[PDB]
Amino acid sequence: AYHWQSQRHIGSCHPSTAPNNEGGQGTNIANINCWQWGDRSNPSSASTRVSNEHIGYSWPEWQIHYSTGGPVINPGQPFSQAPWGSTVAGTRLTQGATEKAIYDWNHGDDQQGMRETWWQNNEHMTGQTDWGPKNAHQSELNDHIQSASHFWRNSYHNTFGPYTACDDHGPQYPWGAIWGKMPDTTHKPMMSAHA
Amino acid sequence: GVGHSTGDYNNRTEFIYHGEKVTIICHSTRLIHINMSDMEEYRIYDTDRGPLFPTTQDLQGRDTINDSYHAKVETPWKLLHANCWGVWFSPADFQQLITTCREIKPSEFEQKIENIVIKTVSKTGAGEQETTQYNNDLTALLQVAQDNSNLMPWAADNFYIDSVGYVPWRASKLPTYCYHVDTWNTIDINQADRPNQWREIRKGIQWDNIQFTPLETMINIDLLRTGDAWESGKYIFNAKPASLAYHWQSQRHIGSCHPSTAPNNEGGQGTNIANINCWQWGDRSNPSSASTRVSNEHIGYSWPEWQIHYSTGGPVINPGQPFSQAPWGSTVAGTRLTQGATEKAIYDWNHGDDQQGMRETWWQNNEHMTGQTDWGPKNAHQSELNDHIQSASHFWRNSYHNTFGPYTACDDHGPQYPWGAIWGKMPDTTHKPMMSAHAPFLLNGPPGQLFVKLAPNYTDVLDNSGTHTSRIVTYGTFWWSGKMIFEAKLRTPRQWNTYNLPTLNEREHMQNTVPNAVGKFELPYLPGRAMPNYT
Amino acid sequence: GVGHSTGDYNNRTEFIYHGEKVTIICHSTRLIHINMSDMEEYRIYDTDRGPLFPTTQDLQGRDTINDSYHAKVETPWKLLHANCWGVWFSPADFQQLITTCREIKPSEFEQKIENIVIKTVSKTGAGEQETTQYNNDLTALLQVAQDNSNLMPWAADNFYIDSVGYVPWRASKLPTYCYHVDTWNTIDINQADRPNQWREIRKGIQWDNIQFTPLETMINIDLLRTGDAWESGKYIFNAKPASLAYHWQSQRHIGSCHPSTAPNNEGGQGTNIANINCWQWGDRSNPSSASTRVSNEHIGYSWPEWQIHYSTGGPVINPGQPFSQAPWGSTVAGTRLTQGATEKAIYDWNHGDDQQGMRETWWQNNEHMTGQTDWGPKNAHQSELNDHIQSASHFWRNSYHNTFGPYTACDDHGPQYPWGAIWGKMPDTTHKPMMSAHAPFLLNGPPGQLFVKLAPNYTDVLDNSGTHTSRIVTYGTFWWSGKMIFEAKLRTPRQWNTYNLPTLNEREHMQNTVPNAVGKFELPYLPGRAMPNYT
Amino acid sequence: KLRTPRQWNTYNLPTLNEREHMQNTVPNAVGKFELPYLPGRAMPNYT
Amino acid sequence: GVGHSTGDYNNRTEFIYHGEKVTIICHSTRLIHINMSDMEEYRIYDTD
């Protein structure tokens, strides 16, 4: 299965009044009764509430990694761009982990002759989506709204942390790999992208 | 039965000591006041954006947070959950927990519902007088639904506390069960086009794959007339114990004392020895100093926060590492800075109907943990570690990048009373959370929710405006019971010097905890986190 | 008992797989709201002709149909029946039925009624205020009558659906039991006297042989006070399995490929071989062609329809063969032609109290079956089959005669959801129906009807205008339960290419199925008929 | 371990993506065809 | 043997259901066309 379930969907519904009209369109209740992340009196809102976990981690990518030993690409977290404008036939942006695949003889000796390509999005997983520059880190979480300074709109730093929970893009057909060799290393890969 | 009293009300907490081990049996039992169930029907709708959500600039990207636009499926099911600590422990009891025993893992859980009483409102009057006559219905249906298989989506948290009340002698009403469905809330702050202002990419709901898991479509449901007791379910936890102590022990305190000469005067004030004999991190001849030495581990990880995280899927905040600001100027009553992970908590009826009326707040610091402290911008990364002092370039004073690494060792802020959550559901994901912030325990699955609703009672004519006038207004009441079993290992003193024992914080003071002359009082906050310890 | 909860509410569907075989256990349980029983007495009367029934020409013979003049014996008995599919299967479940397993024969049926609650209306007021006080009657009689012997005439169909509701959380009221008695409705269209206009030969009822089978005159009836559970009856079906697949395979596709040369170009476009080597139907030398070749069977039979059938006894329609019009221009949103067997279905409360208010319609095509298609006038019968091409005479382009013959092989339109009928009573007749249109199963006898009525509760004085004021207005409520057992054989893939899986039709789209913000929704239509298959 | 339905509403079953369409999968008149891409990833689920 | 057909070609996939559990037995068998082995010798070289 794939998880559309994402962060801010995991806990209970933020209390609200059911709409009288059909359909609402509302409505929201201000005074609660819930935890908050900072020193935050107002407004208490579902944007900020404590949750035992976090889904997805922003990655600074695409990252060209120069080692002995490369250039190589260090993977990011697989997620769809569908919630954003990216879709097949525009706007096509690859910012997720989206791996094109070249094939042979799907039409061969026709000849195309080159090549058979795919590039899954991969569109079904909307839960883990992190578009790195969209995030913003701010110093003070005080309920007072944020000043000019202290708010950094574009930053690419790795957000992976011990709380996070992430998924690979899982078995995919036909061209996937049922298995691959775990390396022999004192630390071991926690999850293997594409395998 | 047919009315004969079918149940018992036992609220007590009784410790056991066999001295290698501490078994804690804590009962609880509490009244519950349930009514309708205003509309009989599963519904789905979009909550509005939010109170302060930006309508227009120049608020620009600043206020993009604190917006709560979600789509829920409101359902006519009320659930009640034990996840609060305060449910199972009277404050004077929770002392003996954090004083004696240094870690506790819940073991066995049991609960039973007896005995149901349902009565209906009947209004009789001309409008000069309206005489409401409250009469029992011996034929009435309180239907209880248990999940041992965790099929329902997990709604049970103390986030939005809404848990069965803490005060044993007060009747506590239940929350209403609803859970989220697939939405797209995505907004942007770049904007890249459009510098500096925000847009709403796509909203608000996606009907293609939406999941409606109308209940009563999974689970065996039981009917309870007056005089019967739904019981029980028998749950057996398995979970990793969690230590009650807090670690003042931090990095640069873990290894041996950097050799030094004892002072002759009283007191020194010194003194330090230059020539050693120790490892160093870089190519470093001089000075060899305890600032730089190799250690098998590192405590704490700087996090870039606070980080507003925009996903489908939010705005949401991705947590940091919990630590105190006490070593820095931050303290209650100034300078108050929140830069750690410090989570304020809103409460109800601590003074209610006084009325405050709004609200009861806390915001622990949390002050006791000084070990893990990382104030992100304080750190600096420099290129060359050569013993030669650093040049103008190569030294970057303020940088916010994540320092979490495979060497690090970190701790959550642990069990905290009353408002904590004894457990929360570990997600189902190929990678699993290594540690859960604000929850002392994660479970492959927990004891499932307990669902309860009064079955509808219709007037003769159900056809027109049934919701407005279909069924007879009704409210039920019943006692809820529970049993927990905790295991523990008590701490015997590791010190010669006298401990500083747990007590309510300086912000709190006693006579607010003991009931007011009119019977209003608040519970204290006492983590828990009680006793310092080595590492 | 004496009130103690006597019953359980379980709505669930749990598959079993032993892999040769698929056992499907589908529970259902649903509330029921019953009141009087307006008049206590068996009655017999004639319904009026009909809304559009012709009063006068020039409508002439055209409108002679759609008249419903029947004589019924209205009785004070309400019956509830499970024959709808939607009763036993949630749509998401009925997927797994038609996806996995290709035929299912119901096996075992069981049902039980618990627990009864009966309360009466009492009106107290001066007319400035009328205060209705709804109070239980612990002494009240809900009397349930079972037929295991099928003595009562069969009233149980989903024709005029009126079945216990589909939505498990909504309280569904029952239909009122009545059945037909001997009548003569006969009308003529010739008229032969009188060309072109219609007369009414004889009406409306015949008292000579009329059969009044006043109930309570056959069957053991049980009384239920609050706190007892009428159970059960144990029924065991025996019936012929019915395949879930649909056959695109039609005549001229059954035998081997007519030999041909593969094309060199991509793609062909050809090519065909003239000289064969095969059988032919007539005296036919040239050309031997796949149009004419002997085959052991024939699929489908042209029917002359639509045929208005005038009997005693009607007007009624005699069915044709079910097939799609998709190969012809007919499709939803044009050209819509109904010439197949295509049966529209009227529904209630799919959006009710919105109000639409009228009505919820469907009209499946039914599009998936292309094999059996016969559009009557398209066919042509010619005298000489000689290889010489046909002359002016001997070729009759339009003729409507029945082509059904002993060679033919035909299929009904099979189980369809929700509104289908799992079973219907095979008639008792020296010749028996070979296949039943719209009913997937016929039974020598089915599980009989289940009859229920609230026993009357009289005021002290019953003598004058008892029907107007005799007995105290009353309504009961109780839960109905059921159990089915289906057996199946699941289909493993016979294809290399990817199947096209079952889903709601293009007419339907998702967010109408998931409840509306005010809680109104419709169920999808998804036969079932799901997977193509060979023949 | 097979999944029994957790929903009331009808699932959206797996099928080849909109980019793909059927007659490319079934062999061409000269016998050339491609295989579909269908993760797999098929069914939505809770968490 | 000495030529007698020594093998079987079975390409099939057959599910099993005991309903707690699904056992999937999927065979495959496929022809293979191999030639030399242009140079008999282990070699080492740098790709451009």
Residue numbers in the entry:
A (entry chain b): 277 to 471
B (entry chain a), C (entry chain e): 33 to 567
D (entry chain b): 521 to 567
E (entry chain b): 33 to 80
Copied sentences from the primary study:
Movie frame micrographs collected for these VLPs, at two different cryo-EM resources (West/Midwest Consortium for High-Resolution Cryo Electron Microscopy and SECM4) yielded capsid structures to 2.84, 3.79, and 3.25 Å resolution from 29,596, 7564, and 5234 particle images, respectively, for BuV1, BuV2, and BuV3. At the top of the 5-fold DE loop, BuV2 residue 160 adopts a different conformation to BuV1/BuV3 residues 161/163 that are structurally similar. This structural difference of BuV2 likely stems from four amino acid changes in the DE loop compared to BuV1 and BuV3 that share the same amino acid composition. BuV2, which is the most different, has more rounded 3-fold protrusions due to VR-I and VR-III and 2/5-fold wall is thicker and more pronounced than BuV1 and BuV3 due to the larger VR-VII. The melting temperature (Tms) of the BuV capsids determined by DSF were 64.9 ± 0.2 °C for BuV1, 77.3 ± 0.3 °C for BuV2, and 73.4 ± 0.2 °C for BuV3. The residues are located below the section of VR-IV positioned on the 2/5-fold wall. This interaction is not possible for BuV1 and BuV3 which conserve the C210 equivalent residue position but have V290 and P292, respectively, at positions equivalent to BuV2 C289. The BuV2 disulfide bond interaction could contribute to the increased capsid stability observed.
The BuVs, along with CuV and TuV belong to the genus Protoparvovirus, which prior the BuV discovery contained only animal (non-human) infecting viruses, and are classified as novel Primate protoparvovirus 1 species.
